[PDB]
Amino acid sequence: QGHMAPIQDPVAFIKQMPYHQVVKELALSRCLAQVSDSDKAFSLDAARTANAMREWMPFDIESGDEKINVLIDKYKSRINEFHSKSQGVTLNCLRLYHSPELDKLSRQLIAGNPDRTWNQDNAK
Amino acid sequence: QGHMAPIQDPVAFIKQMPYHQVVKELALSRCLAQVSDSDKAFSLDAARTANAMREWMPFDIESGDEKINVLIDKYKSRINEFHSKSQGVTLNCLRLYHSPELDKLSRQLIAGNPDRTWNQDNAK
């Protein structure tokens, strides 16, 4: 009730990002898909969001898929030794998203300069 | 099988962030909690992750809770008019997370300098 109007360009905010950041958005979204119920609407939404990111960057799909997925696998299942009741899978995905490892990989998986944006390459 | 060892300080990566960024982590995590099934393990995990962020920043809880939540509400339910099958609730939360609006609010809700870090204030 009292819902806001539809979003006209859903990926406008992605198209303004440097490509290395788009890779991180894909990685985060897929991590979230993998740590939630594969047979649920949220997990499916996150998976499709991750996959859709590839349209907006010159991503190296053939090698990049498994390189990203192996890295996700190194973060997503960690047991969090919290100090002083959930497992913190969301926290694991955030740790991945901010990791130096993902930051390094995010630059390697982009054809050309990883600091360019989709808008730069397609709109102007 | 072949699982990696437990994480010793789960929030080490949060403690190194400028406080305004910690607010964004809270906002993203809670957005993810709200767009997933409230009666599911993932949603609960995301909620607890969001709530746990407050320990690591001088956050203005009394006003900040609803200010963050009103902003989440302006992003989370948007209908994405995709060009050329999920609703893209994950995308909505990412849009929130990168929004100028959240960036502005994230600085307003921190006592003192919002560019300081937990480590700066507590460890050295």
Numbering used by the authors:
A (entry chain A), B (entry chain A): 24 to 107, 112 to 151
Q: What is written in the article reporting this PDB entry?
A:
The S. marcescens Rap proteins represent founder members of a new bacterial protein family, members of which represent immunity proteins for T6-secreted toxins, as exemplified by Rap1a and Rap2a. We have determined the structures of two members of this family, Rap1b and Rap2b, revealing a new protein fold. The Rap subunit is constructed around a helical bundle of five helices (α2–α6). The Rap proteins display an extensive dimerization interface, consistent with the observation that each Rap protein exists as a stable dimer in solution.
Well-ordered crystals of Rap1b and Rap2b were obtained and the structures were elucidated at 1.9 Å and 2.0 Å resolution respectively. The asymmetric unit of the Rap1b structure consists of a single subunit and crystallographic symmetry generates the dimer. An overlay of Rap1b and Rap2b subunits matches 71 Cα atoms with a r.m.s.d. of 1.4 Å. A disulphide linkage (Cys54–Cys120 in Rap1b, Cys41–Cys101 in Rap2b) tethers α2 and α5 together. By virtue of being longer than Rap2b, Rap1b has an extension of five residues at the N-terminus and 13 at the C-terminus, the latter of which form a short helix α7. These segments of Rap1b are on the surface of the molecules at opposite ends of the dimer. The Rap1b dimer uses almost 24% of the accessible surface area of a subunit in formation of the dimer. Surprisingly for proteins with such low pI values, the striking surface feature conserved in Rap1b and Rap2b structures is a crescent-shaped basic patch on either side of the dimer. However, the role of Rap1b and Rap2b is not yet known. While they do not appear to play a role in self-resistance, they may play a role in resistance towards closely related bacteria secreting similar toxins.
